Amino acid sequence: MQHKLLINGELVSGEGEKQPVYNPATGDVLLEIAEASAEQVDAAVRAADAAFAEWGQTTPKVRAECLLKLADVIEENGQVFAELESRNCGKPLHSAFNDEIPAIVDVFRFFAGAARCLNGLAAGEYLEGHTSMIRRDPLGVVASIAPWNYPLMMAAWKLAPALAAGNCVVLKPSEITPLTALKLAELAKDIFPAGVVNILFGRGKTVGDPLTGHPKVRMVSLTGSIATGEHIISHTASSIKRTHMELGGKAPVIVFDDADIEAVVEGVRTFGYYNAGQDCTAACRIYAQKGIYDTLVEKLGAAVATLKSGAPDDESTELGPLSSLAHLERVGKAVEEAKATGHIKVITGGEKRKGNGYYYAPTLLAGALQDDAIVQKEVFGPVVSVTPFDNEEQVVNWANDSQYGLASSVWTKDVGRAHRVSARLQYGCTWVNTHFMLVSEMPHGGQKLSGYGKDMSLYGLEDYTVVRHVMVKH
Amino acid sequence: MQHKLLINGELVSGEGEKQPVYNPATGDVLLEIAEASAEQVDAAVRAADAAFAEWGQTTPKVRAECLLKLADVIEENGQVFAELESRNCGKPLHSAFNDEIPAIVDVFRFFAGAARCLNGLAAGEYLEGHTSMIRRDPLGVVASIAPWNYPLMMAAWKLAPALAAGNCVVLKPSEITPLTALKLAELAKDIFPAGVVNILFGRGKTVGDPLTGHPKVRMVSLTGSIATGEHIISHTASSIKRTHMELGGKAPVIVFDDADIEAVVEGVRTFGYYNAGQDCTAACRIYAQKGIYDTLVEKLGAAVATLKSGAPDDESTELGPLSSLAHLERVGKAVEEAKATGHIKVITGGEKRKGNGYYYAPTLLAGALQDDAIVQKEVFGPVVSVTPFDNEEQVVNWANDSQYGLASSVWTKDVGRAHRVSARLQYGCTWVNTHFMLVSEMPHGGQKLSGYGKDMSLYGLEDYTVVRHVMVKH
Amino acid sequence: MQHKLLINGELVSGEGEKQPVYNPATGDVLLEIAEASAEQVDAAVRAADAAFAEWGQTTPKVRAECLLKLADVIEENGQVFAELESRNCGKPLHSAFNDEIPAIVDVFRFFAGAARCLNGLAAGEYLEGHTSMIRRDPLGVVASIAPWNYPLMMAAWKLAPALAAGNCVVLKPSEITPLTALKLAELAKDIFPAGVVNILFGRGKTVGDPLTGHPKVRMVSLTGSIATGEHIISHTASSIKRTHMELGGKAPVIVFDDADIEAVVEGVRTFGYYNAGQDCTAACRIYAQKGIYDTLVEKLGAAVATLKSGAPDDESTELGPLSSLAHLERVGKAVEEAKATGHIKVITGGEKRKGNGYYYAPTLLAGALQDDAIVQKEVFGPVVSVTPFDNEEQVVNWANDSQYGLASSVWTKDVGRAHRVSARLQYGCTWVNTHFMLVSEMPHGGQKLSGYGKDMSLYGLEDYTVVRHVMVKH
Amino acid sequence: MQHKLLINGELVSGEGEKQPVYNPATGDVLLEIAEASAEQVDAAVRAADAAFAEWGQTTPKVRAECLLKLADVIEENGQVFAELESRNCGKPLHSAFNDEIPAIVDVFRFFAGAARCLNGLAAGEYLEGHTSMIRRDPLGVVASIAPWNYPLMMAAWKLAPALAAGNCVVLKPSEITPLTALKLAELAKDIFPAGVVNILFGRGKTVGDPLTGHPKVRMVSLTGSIATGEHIISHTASSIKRTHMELGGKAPVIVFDDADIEAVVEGVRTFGYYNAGQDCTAACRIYAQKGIYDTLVEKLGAAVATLKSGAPDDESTELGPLSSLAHLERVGKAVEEAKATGHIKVITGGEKRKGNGYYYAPTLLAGALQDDAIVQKEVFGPVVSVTPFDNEEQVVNWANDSQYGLASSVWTKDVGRAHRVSARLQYGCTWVNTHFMLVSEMPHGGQKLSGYGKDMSLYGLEDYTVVRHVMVKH
Ligand SMILES: [Ca+2]
Ligand SMILES: [Ca+2]
Ligand SMILES: [Ca+2]
Ligand SMILES: [Ca+2]
């Protein structure tokens, strides 16, 4: 275990209070790590600001080359990154290695290429006797805050576009899951000029707040809870900082009577429980048309019941633990509240596992109504609810009657219906006859309380630049 | 004399407390207008939300047709609009009619065309066996808050793109200058379906806050002060609303030894004093190279001294009054502070005019240093300061060491220097050998405390949509 | 009727040989019109070339305003234009007036808007110390050759984008259908500066050849037959002229077993026979899956048999005559060849109408095989053929094994199949569960022998510009 | 060494007549290579056509990865490639290695990135009840013909975008310079699926004609002479093939009285003579303002006279020989033609060098007039001409009065002038205060007889796709 911070091209020990990092599969401490002191937070931001003078002036080609080298370093170290993430998060090692690592490497390669492909408006004389042109310049110092559910992947989503755009970055991983970020710190120390990338460690109150509130920080990019989002916005209000957030989701899964039910089941067994449901696009809120409602519930219940939980290093393990005791307790609470409703039935699961670590049984709840908390509020655990609906107009309005707006799916064999519904859903992404698939070229980002700004795609790159108009009188 | 609110396709009287509207050229009350009550603010947002169901689904062609009709109505009523704005704001009538009206009409015509020209990423299979496409959908209800310096123009800048994008709008003009917006309410009542456009009137605390804080409002667009900007961001944090903000400027005007001094003088006499300097891009902060400094100051001083102030309806009037008694006092205070500095010389002006109305003399201050308040803080009055500089590296770093980032100009005959400086200035716009020129197709917007988001251009339209990814498994 | 040419802002009589223009509904001559002489063709190109000096430098705003004026003039003369087109082409007057006129007006309004929204690459430093920008400038003089099937529409498709881009145009309508273009000449004479738009009249050999071969012509835009396309390309080879070509089609209409047969029938009754099948996107080549084949043929046969042929000015007329005696002869030949095959059955029609004019009976042929001439070669008449198919892979390969590539449709209720087929069809346009719908913002243009270049959309505008890279060392 | 063709994933000997390849520095034969037989040309195209079925459906990510691997292979083999090109073309080894190789590797890396960043129009409902989307699909089989001046680089410019777009390619290098392409064939054999890339060898008439005329070829990309361009266009007319053409240049270099003369001289000494002037962007046609005309001529004459000719493998060699005996004679004829004029002076050079190889002395001609052949016709040798001019309007009109339109440069210190002239030049590229600089992200391509279509940049990638509109009724 690497445990040093990266500040201005050097690896240094944190000077703040030591913090424990746990293995959620066993509930044991992996190690205690000193967090950044206030002076180190300040030194990180100042180093990034000083490095911006030269970095912000580099060509896209040069930045692309640094991104390609970083992608190669992560690829070369894929096994070690997968092992660390598996130990820190409890993710099944085969999933971390086969799914996450290649996606992370690709994000950096994609953005290396995108850095050189920025669009604009044609230059020309829009006012007689004056030539106008449009540029896209970097902002300056970006503070990035990564969540604990996909520590390395989210670090990549924030680092890649920011750097590609020519900004310098100060990254703060979640205090719960810093291991892969600190390994990255070690490996990436010499790829970019000193201060262009800085990596800190610590809690929101002791490290995150001084970071996001620093006068030299121009943009704050956050993936986390709505509460944390609200706090950051209020905390940066005084300096009008640009913000980029992704705050959570409660993806509606709309299943019509003509859907391939076997495919929906096979799909949700994966998409509602992958990463133990700790995914902002988890297929957690199912709306099933009255005609297939009971068949779907019965078949899905049987499929969810076979999900195998066990050691993350076991190839047969499909379901890992929740990230912490606190999160385990919150998931349990949401389930009990759904049960106290009187009209929700536990089809399978609905209880914590006996034993060490923070495992919760794969759970399916049926009979949930539109206005119930289990349908209106994110749980972020291995829990899926099913609600019956009558018709298309009704279900689209129910799905759109939500505070969330990140992702959604519609399941139907009818061409007309698939396009009608996709056109009307107020969600950043809509999959048809699938769910959960992301690619580096297509944007991912929400609407409403899910936030704003995109991760991945050229739009993700654009978010980290400012458009400028230069007009020459001639 | 129009004084009614536009709510859900009907013209109704405000039900709140009456508020006086002044003629800044005489200091006399033009009339008292009842502001919107709390219930009316709520009714406007609810009508916009209800109208969005259909409006948000219209084609670009249909929206473009509405925008062209509005442009024609404004053009046909050009003289009336120019008279109202001159009476309410004190702008010379000839300027309001010859400069503002055509620009306003053009904003609507431009966005009518832009509504039909939105870019995206090519649709295709980025993941084997899945077709992806990118759409740009509207957000919903937009709350727009217009400032008092260019009431009708800023109303146009907020209405046009929001509507072109398919959103419904609730607009609140400044309590100081509602006349043109209320005339627009009368004229535009039947062009869009009921509830698509709503226009209210009232103070920030009484009407603005209830409006921007409404749960169904998805985006808030503001042009105003930095202080107002911080207040709105804090106010909307709880619901993660999207914001779009232009908050003020202090445009650096960089004059090198090889500039055409006669052109700089003729330029600044207009750009530093137009609209009495109440313009976020006013040429107010001059950095002049030591070689030409004394020559520039003496010639500028003599040119500024001939600016003619008088009745706004007189064709010879070049300089109108400031917007209010309060603003006149603030401007006066900033000048007195500059003078108490001990090292700033008043070349001309520096006093309020005797007589009725809120007139302040066209003022030129010389010897101001980089760290003086007159250089670091927006005055927003008929006041220009000049600071000497030694070299290119020094002055670009000075200019960039600002909390502002809206607009700027550089004056030099050298091709190399013009491009070098333009490339490095941290301002949304940089003019070369001119200043102050805007066109509908080129974006206008800031960086840093000046805010974010663009007015005008296709980027201005894009700011009012959300990018969505639809992916079909096939 | 107007019969004068528009050359350099003047209306002048042709100085060449007189040529007859026929009313295809009666076979009688509407009038004799003198064609442009050699010297007039040359004078038109020289006028366009001289006008380009100033026109090529105008702003988009100015050009947009001229296009809006032209749209207004056509709109105000809608009835007259519809009547001329109906008399010259035999199109049912109600169709010309209700369908064509509004689309024509829209093309001009669309391009007025698009002229101001041209994209490019972001300006910036791609090579250290050098600022690059991308412009889109006009080419110069464009020669446009319009076909006889939609004379005014096609004239608009060529004029609007070329002018919007800043080029000067010399337009030559078909010798068969010049009436609407010569009326346009009259009405549009004063909208653009002298020489910016020129309209000639005459045959391909006497007027078209000297026009397209003029050394000052930079681009030739043609809608016509493959043979004509080949001739023009060979004729312009020596000067490397840019070409833009739409040469014919044979839209495959692929109907799967799960399609809505009643919708297919109702659809094809219109799409296969509108404008008497003289439409490059006519639904003329049906591939019908073996399950629904017999049902489709019988129902389509009955539906096609009720199409009403009669006087163009009678509201109940649905089918007009073919455009010329010669085209009537060619259509009859192709049907007789299909019949001599021995395996093709005439379900309905298959003969010329007795009486005056060039009417051909609405015709449906069944049992056509992939390799038959009726499936492989364009007929451009009121004739539709049906070919049975077994499976998806087979039919997509059949449809793609064609020299044509303009448009296509697929009819199926299955989401997956609709996207799979749409993705693989080698045709510029693919409609799903409809056919024949065009809008000003979406491009229309082919592949393979159908040609290249787009009409309508922003792409249609880009085709009339040249991208330029300006790079300033600094 | 390598002399085999690449056909359908296999390296095979040509079956046609043996052809000699010369070392232009010594005039000796390097070797005899069997060219492709007619059957081999047909097998190459059929292989490409069959590979397209699968290749044309790959994802951009997959194609990008193949391009990155090819870039890596070229980079690793940089020295070998540089040595072959130097031996085959006579280019100074140090220039081929330090300039060409890194640029070639970057073309492939740039397009790997650009393959994943294609733009389109937003998908949505442009017609009520119908969802439209825009795709960019590949064409099919692309025939590429590379010239002899930059064999490998031109091969890369043709291969990279075509492959990135999803097409299969059949490449033919010039008969005089096949060595690098055949080495590439060996190295690239296993990077793409069989038949996706094919490389042939032979003469224009025996190999190039059967290739560009093949019915399955959909696009022909040529860099070569105007005569070859005209022939190809005529040759492919019968099948309406798409063409992409770069046919030669005669770059005007406009030098105003306020230019930095020493920079002009140092620049042209390089740009007028690099690659022995066998460059379509060579700085060969200088227009010098009357004020500095004589000074420029004298200084340039002295600088050009020191250019060192010698063995290509000698690091001190600056100027290599011309490509062939026939090209050397053509260059010598053009010079003699200029001298027979009676008003052109030879400042330096103007004769073939004594000895073996195809060396011609670096030449500067003065007093050339606008209408002289030396000014109007490309020489493509180490020859530069200088013509005096009076004013800006005159010289812009002279420069624009040319059959060429590829590249240009303007030299002046004045901001206004630089932009005015750049705005008006009818050339694909204009450099300001430099010349000859290309980057992978910015397009290179001509207008008029220089051709059309772009190399490099996203536009170069777009040229190899067809835009498609898919519209779903719903
Ligand atoms: Ca969601
Ligand atoms: Ca500013
Ligand atoms: Ca077709
Ligand atoms: Ca050229």
Candidate list B66, B280, B284, B429, residue with the active-site label: B280
The burial of D444, by beta-carbon neighbours within 10 Å (0-12 exposed, 13-18 middle, 19 or more buried), is given as buried
Task: Give the number of C-D residue pairs with CB atoms closer than 8 Å.
Answer: 163
CA D247 vs. chain centroid, Å, equals 9
What tokens were used for C317? 């007329």
For testing contact with chain A, the best of C119, C125, C134, C137 (most A CBs within 10 A) = C134
> Annotated binding residues of B, as ranges?
146-148, 172-175, 209, 225-228, 280
Coil, helix or strand at residue C339: helix
Backbone angles phi, psi at A381, to 5 degrees: -150, 180
Dihedral of CA B37/B39/B45/B48: which sign? negative
Cβ neighbors of C13 (< 8 A, separation 6 or more) are C3, C4, C5, C34
Minimal-distance CA residue of chain B relative to D432: B415
For testing contact with chain B, the best of C65, C132, C441, C462 (most B CBs within 10 A) = C441
Cα–Cα distance, D207 to D204 (Å, whole number): 6
What tokens were used for A326? 């606190």
What tokens were used for B291? 């070689």
Which run of H or of E encompasses C71? helix C60-76
Cα–Cα distance, C240 to D449 (Å, whole number): 5
Cα–Cα distance, C71 to C68 (Å, whole number): 5
Report CA Rg, chain D: 23
* Interface check C125 vs A, CB under 8 A: yes
CB B254 within 8 A of CB B287: yes
* DSSP β-bridge partners for residue D404: none
Q: How far is the CA of D72 from the centre of ligand 1 (A)?
A: 41
CA distances to A260, A380, A431, A470 from A419, rounded to whole Å, are: 17, 29, 11, 42
Which residues of D are known catalytic residues? 246, 280
Residue range(s) occupied by CATH 3.40.309.10 in chain C: 249-439
C351 is in an annotated binding site: no
CB D176 within 8 A of CB D123: no
Cα–Cα distance, B370 to B378 (Å, whole number): 14
Q: Is C280 in the active site?
A: yes
Cα–Cα distance, A173 to A176 (Å, whole number): 8
Structure determination method: X-ray
Sequence length of chain D is: 474
Look-up of token digits 């993700």: A460
What tokens were used for C472? 């300033």
* Single-letter residue type at C450: S
* Coarse DSSP helix, strand, coil percentages of chain D, rounded to the nearest 5 percent: 40, 25, 35
Cα–Cα distance, C419 to C414 (Å, whole number): 9
Give alpha helix (H) positions in C200-355.
Answer: 209-212, 226-236, 261-271, 290-305, 325-340
Which candidate, D206, C119, C131, places its Cα nearest to that of A57? C131
Contacts 24+ apart (CB under 8 A), C264-270: C264/C296, C264/C300, C264/C411, C265/C296, C265/C299, C265/C300, C265/C303, C266/C303, C267/C434, C267/C435, C267/C436, C268/C300, C268/C303, C268/C304, C268/C384, C268/C435, C269/C300, C269/C303, C269/C304, C269/C307, C270/C436
DSSP label at residue B389 = E
Cβ neighbors of B453 (< 8 A, separation 6 or more) are B221, B243, B244, B245, B246, B445, B460, B463
Cα–Cα distance, D105 to D184 (Å, whole number): 12
* DSSP β-bridge partners for residue D410: D254, D432
- B116–C60 C-beta distance less than 8 A: no
CA distances to B432, C66, C121 from A129, rounded to whole Å, are: 12, 20, 22
Tally of CB atoms within 10 A around C238: 16
Nearest-5° Cα angle at B423, B422 to B428: 70
Tally of CB atoms within 10 A around A1: 12
Cα–Cα distance, D462 to D474 (Å, whole number): 30
- A416–C126 C-beta distance less than 8 A: no
Selecting from B139, B431, B457 the residue whose C-beta is nearest the C-beta of A121 gives B457
Sort out which chain A residues have CB atoms less than 8 A from B448's CB and list them: 218, 240
Chain C, residues 293-322, CB within 8 A of chain D, namely: none
CB B433 within 8 A of CB A473: yes
* DSSP β-bridge partners for residue C465: C138
* Interface check B17 vs C, CB under 8 A: no
Nearest-5° Cα angle at D165, B123 to A61: 100
Coil, helix or strand at residue D297: helix
Cα–Cα distance, A68 to A359 (Å, whole number): 38
The burial of B306, by beta-carbon neighbours within 10 Å (0-12 exposed, 13-18 middle, 19 or more buried), is given as exposed
**N-term to C-term CA, chain B:** 62
Selecting from D124, D125, D441 the residue whose C-beta is nearest the C-beta of A116 gives D441
Cα–Cα distance, A423 to A445 (Å, whole number): 17
Cα–Cα distance, B213 to B228 (Å, whole number): 14
* Interface check D129 vs B, CB under 8 A: no
Cβ neighbors of C447 (< 8 A, separation 6 or more) are C405, C406, C426, C427, C428, D139, D218, D466
Residue range(s) occupied by CATH 3.40.605.10 in chain B: 1-248+440-474
Cα–Cα distance, A145 to A151 (Å, whole number): 10
Sequence length of chain B is: 474
HSE-CB of D31 using CA atoms within 13 angstroms: 13
Cα–Cα distance, D187 to D171 (Å, whole number): 15
**Interface chains of chain B (3 or more CB pairs under 8 Å):** A, C, D
- B114–C416 C-beta distance less than 8 A: no
Sort out which chain D residues have CB atoms less than 8 A from B114's CB and list them: none
Cα–Cα distance, D23 to D85 (Å, whole number): 10
Chain B, residues 214-233, CB within 8 A of chain A, namely: 218, 226, 229-230, 233
Dihedral of CA A349/A352/A354/A358: which sign? positive
From the CA of D278, how many Å to the nearest CA of chain C? 22
Cα–Cα distance, C11 to C182 (Å, whole number): 10
Selecting from C109, C119, C473 the residue whose C-beta is nearest the C-beta of B119 gives C119
CA distances to A70, A435, B280 from A83, rounded to whole Å, are: 19, 27, 55
DSSP label at residue A316 = T
Q: β-pairing, B119-121 with B465-473?
A: unpaired
* DSSP β-bridge partners for residue C23: C28
CA A208 vs. chain centroid, Å, equals 18
> Which ligand neighbours the alpha carbon of A285 most closely?
1
What tokens were used for C210? 């000297």
Coil, helix or strand at residue D33: strand
Sort out which chain B residues have CB atoms less than 8 A from C473's CB and list them: 416
* Interface check B126 vs D, CB under 8 A: yes
Sort out which chain A residues have CB atoms less than 8 A from D124's CB and list them: 423
What tokens were used for A5? 């911070």
* Interface check C459 vs D, CB under 8 A: yes
Cα–Cα distance, D91 to D311 (Å, whole number): 9
Look-up of token digits 């099919």: D140
Cα–Cα distance, A98 to C201 (Å, whole number): 69
| Superfamily for the B1-248+440-474 domain | Aldehyde Dehydrogenase; Chain A, domain 1 (3.40.605.10)
CB C387 within 8 A of CB C338: no
Cβ neighbors of D446 (< 8 A, separation 6 or more) are D246, D247, D249, D404, D405, D406, D407, D427, D428, D452
CA distances to B352, C240, D268, D337 from D404, rounded to whole Å, are: 64, 11, 20, 20
Sort out which chain C residues have CB atoms less than 8 A from A116's CB and list them: 126
Which run of H or of E encompasses C346? strand C345-348
Sort out which chain D residues have CB atoms less than 8 A from C240's CB and list them: 226, 229-230, 233, 245, 247, 448-452
Cα–Cα distance, A51 to A194 (Å, whole number): 7
Helix axes B151-164, B78-89, angle to 10 degrees: 130
For B249-439, which CATH class?
A: alpha beta
Selecting from C218, C459, C471 the residue whose C-beta is nearest the C-beta of D431 gives C471
A430 is in an annotated binding site: no
Minimal-distance CA residue of chain D relative to A106: D61
Which run of H or of E encompasses D396? helix D392-400
Coil, helix or strand at residue C30: strand
Coil, helix or strand at residue A263: helix
Cα–Cα distance, A153 to A134 (Å, whole number): 32
CA distances to A116, B9, C459, D80, D419 from D431, rounded to whole Å, are: 21, 56, 27, 33, 11
Q: Is B246 in the active site?
A: yes
Cβ neighbors of D216 (< 8 A, separation 6 or more) are D45, D46, D48, D49, D140, D141
Cα–Cα distance, D77 to B74 (Å, whole number): 67
Cα–Cα distance, C294 to C388 (Å, whole number): 9
What tokens were used for C187? 């009405």
What beta strand segments (E) does C76-123 contain? 119-121
From the CA of C218, how many Å to the nearest CA of chain D? 7
Sequence length of chain C is: 474
The torsion defined by the Cα of B1, B4, B5 and B7, in degrees rounded to 10, comes to -130
Coil, helix or strand at residue A221: strand
Coil, helix or strand at residue D50: helix
Minimal-distance CA residue of chain D relative to A60: D441
What beta strand segments (E) does C147-289 contain? 168-172, 197-199, 217-223, 242-246, 252-255, 285-289
Cβ neighbors of D20 (< 8 A, separation 6 or more) are D29, D31, D32
Which run of H or of E encompasses D47? helix D38-55
The torsion defined by the Cα of D448, D450, D452 and D454, in degrees rounded to 10, comes to -140
